[PDB]
Every structure is written in structure tokens, then in C-alpha cells.
């Protein structure tokens, strides 16, 4: 069902479909270290990806349906040079007819053109004054379905965001060549990242789109806040999804000391551009291998690990006394060689029992392989103290709404720009 | 009181850590570059037509103090009570507020 699908291979980009699309790549196209299947394009002329189809699959029909899907990571817009500056990132237009994908300040645009120069555009708008965004500098699964008979639709992370009728458009003749390059961007320090570009010759329904989203999500591997792979030996700031105005902190170091959620969070501002919340607040959480059999640094599902807490540029260990009063075992930061036999091994979870993808959960365990429970928070006398509890396990068993046991790992990223 | 206000028209401070406690002043047209403001109290002090550019504010207590027609660039407000009502018609660019002090959301006077 897929006609074009750019994937990575041995030091090149190939097309998985049985059409063998020729791909021409500029000398300034970059790749990640860890997920080299994600591609980076910067604002220069040499940052070029050129893919050429065959004549047998050129879109030149009257009522042919088609769809596209890809993942995009768009950095934060920092200044007012970025306003009112729609720039094209994916181009498929020849002779003022075709389809194109463009970006503006806080927008992702899908555009269609016929030979009569009719414009139909479908836009996904995300604000950038929000405290915590799901779209700024984070991976977004964008898929667009076009029904030549009814209307055209844009889907963000599997859900329908906008739709506009395209019945009036009569004939689209797209180009033989597809261009991945920033066009018309006045900011010289601007870039995007894309991955998993696919094309289909039918309008996908919500079922197929959700299937594709789940299949391409790599549910077996944890993801950090930006949507990249989670890695051992790397500092991470911690965000609790249930209470996202507070950041993890400690007050003392030892068995007597505890760690809690302190707030409120700060803010990073550029007047009339962005008024987000500071994400580099609190104590970093390094994750260390304990029993990972994989050679890579990637943290996968059910990987028993250790957790180091960075306090005053010194490393400590996240552990509890399993035998204490109550169900909520309070988490504490200990000297790494003075932990003894306290429960420290954490089982990292990416998906649930049924395999449904969810956020990051940490399951504190003892040396007997017994579940103290999911790591969360519990308020003691108006202090939101970090605990490990089996209550969260009970709600998970009862398919209830767990409160406070889901976490995000926030490393320092260049696309956010906060001053640490 | 308003009769005794001192005015300093035009200033250019650059690379100094600069604390004080000033009362009933107006600064107009200042230009500060890479300055540190640690542990200072401001009573009825008003900054006007100023530029702050990689400045740093730490432990600032503000009593009826305003920044009008002021421009802040790559500045940090750490542990300060300079809330959003003390920047009248200002522009912040890539500025950061951290560990804001507790206080009222409106100017209540500190008599
Ligand atoms: C606003 O900041 C961004 C991000 O830069 C980071 O944050 C700053 C506050 C400061 O701490 C920098 O040292 C940080 O790197 C600036 O955008 C980047 O600027 C750097 C040079 O400083 C440049 O190398 C990058 O390419 C820029 N990245 C992007 C995405 O543009 C931005 O320039 C600052 N705003 C203004 C108006 O200058
Ligand atoms: C703060 O101000 C006082 C008097 O204005 C000065 O003596 C002192 O040195 C200042 N603090 C620092 C850290 O220099
Ligand atoms: C301050 O003066 C006027 C506003 O009264 C304005 O034209 C000018 O640009 C301002 N200066 C700065 C640096 O913002």
C-alpha cells in the first residue's frame, strides 16, 4: 500500500517500496548518533534531500486518493524574525501544481494546488505561550489524508486536528521529484528534523493511522521528554505529569533525608514570542545499567536499572527501606557505597501489561524480585514527598486512573535554548 | 516626597557587581552590559528607557519599583520579587525568572 518510504540503511537512505526511488542527498545533511534513522536539515542550500519517483506513480489523475505520513521535530522560535515567515520544508510542486508541506510560527501547513491555481490549505496550530507544550521541540507524528471526493484532513499523533473540503479542486499534477529543504526561511539559524516519511495511494482511516502511529512509535523502548531514546549515564531533569509545576528536589542526604516535589517552576520569556516554563529545574536523574544484556546505551522495556541522583554535582543513589510503616515507601538519596541492602533496583516500564504504549513508569524492586511498587508522590502534611507504593499497582490491576506515577525525562536540548 | 526625587539622566555601566539600597530615585536612559545585582532593596526607584543586556538579578526586594520602556536581553531574575506588574511597557528577550519570591500580584505599597 506504500509507494514511497524513506528509511535508513548502510550509510545511505533507501526506499523500502518495490519502486526503487532514487535519492540524492546534499553534502550538509546530518544524522543523529543514536537514532541515525532521523534526519536533520538546516537552513543552507547544500542541506538537500532529493528523491525521484517513477513515471508509473506520478500523481496526475482526476479522483486518485493519496496520503502521506512523517515525524517532525521543530525547534522553538526564539525571536520576532520568525513571525509571518511561512517556509516550505517538503515540496512536490511543478508548474504551480502539486502538494507541499510548510511551517510558520507555531503552525504546520498542508497545501494543495491544481492546474487552475486553486489553493486549499489545512493547518495545525500549536501555541507557544503554554506552560508545557506537547509540540515545541518534540517529535510529532503528522499524517495527511486526501479524499478527492469529500475533503482533506490533517492528523497529529493519530487524532484529527483540522479538515477542509477539497471537492472544488479538479486536477492535481504533482512533480516527479520531491524536495526536502527549507525554502524561504529568513532565520539563518533555523533547522528541522524528520524521520519515517511514507506515501500511500489511498486515504487512510483512523484505524490504519493509529496502527501506523503505534508501529512507528517503537513501544519497546523508552523515550525522553523530546521523544528521543532514553539512555544510561546521561543526566535528566524530572517532570511529573500529574503535577507539572513542581520539580524533584532533595533536602538532606541519607536515610533520614527525603526527596520531594518543590514548586512552582520558573519561566523563560521572550515578549510576544514565548512564555514557557523552565524545564531545567531540580535534580538530575542518571540511570545506570544493572542487568541490561544489550550492548547499546539505550534503555528498553523491563530493564532493571539503578538511579543516581545528582545533588550539588555529586552522585547519590535512589533507594528505600522496604520494611517501614505504611504502604508508601519514601524515596531517599544515599551515598552510593553506603546503600547496603536497601531496595534500589528499578524496573523501567514503557508499555502496560496489554502492550499499550504509555509514558515512563519506574517500578522499585528489592533483591528478592518483589514489587515495592511504582514510584510516585504522596503528600505528607502539605509536602509532596516522593514515594514507592503498591497502590498504583492496585489501580493498574483495576484499570483505574493512576495519579502521579508517570514521569518525563528532560535532557538539555539545543532546540529549547534555556539557560542552565 | 515626590519633591525630593533624584534623577540621573543617562548612565553607562559595564561589567560590575553592583548592590545598594536606594530610595526615591529615577534612572532614565541607562545602558547596563554584563552587570550583577545581588541583594539590593528598591524603594520608589524607577528605571526608565533603560537597556539590560546579560544582566543578573539575585535577591532583589522591590517596594514600589517599576521598569518602564525598558529592554532586557539574556537577563536572569533569580530569587527576586520583580513580578509582571513591575515591567510597564517593557520587552524581555530570552529572559529567565527563577525562584520567584512570594508576594501579592498587585502593587500594595510597603509603608
Ligand atoms: C535566544 O536563545 C536562543 C538559544 O540559545 C541558547 O539560549 C541563550 C539564552 C544563550 O544561553 C545561548 O548561549 C544558548 O545557546 C538563541 O538561538 C541560538 O543562538 C546560538 C548562539 O547563541 C546559535 O548558535 C544557535 O544556532 C541559535 N539557535 C536557534 C534555534 O536559533 C537566540 O539567538 C537567542 N535570541 C536572540 C534574539 O538572539
Ligand atoms: C552590599 O552593599 C554593601 C553596602 O552598600 C557593601 O558594603 C557590600 O560589599 C555589598 N555586598 C557585596 C557582596 O559586596
Ligand atoms: C524609550 O523611549 C521611547 C518610548 O517612550 C521609544 O521610542 C524608545 O525606543 C525607547 N527605548 C528603548 C531602548 O526601548
Author numbering:
A (entry chain B): 876 to 1295
B (entry chain A): 480 to 590
The publication says:
Synaptic vesicle glycoprotein 2a (SV2A), a putative membrane transporter in the synaptic vesicles (SVs), has been identified as a target of LEV and BRV. SV2A also serves as a receptor for botulinum neurotoxin (BoNT), which is the most toxic protein and has paradoxically emerged as a potent reagent for therapeutic and cosmetic applications. SV2 family proteins belong to the major facilitator superfamily (MFS) with 12 predicted transmembrane helices. In addition to the transmembrane domain (TMD) core, a cytosolic N-terminal region and a large fourth luminal domain (LD4) are present.
The open edge of the β-strand from the β-hairpin of HCA2 forms backbone hydrogen bonding interactions with the open edge of the C-terminal β-strand from the β-helix structure of LD4A. In addition to the backbone–backbone interaction, the SV2A His578 side chain forms a salt bridge with the BoNT/A2 Glu1156 side chain. SV2A Phe576 contributes to the van der Waals interactions with Ser1142 and Val1144 of BoNT/A2. The protein–protein interaction between HCA2 and LD4A creates a relatively small binding interface with a buried surface area of 464 Å2. To enhance this interaction, N-glycans attached to LD4A contribute to binding. Three putative N-glycan sites, Asn498, Asn548, and Asn573 in SV2A, are mapped on LD4A. A N-glycan containing two N-acetylglucosamines (NAG)s and fucose (FUC) attached to Asn573 forms extensive contacts with HCA2. The BoNT/A2 Phe953 and the aliphatic portion of the BoNT/A2 Arg1064 form the van der Waals contacts with the two NAGs attached to LD4A.
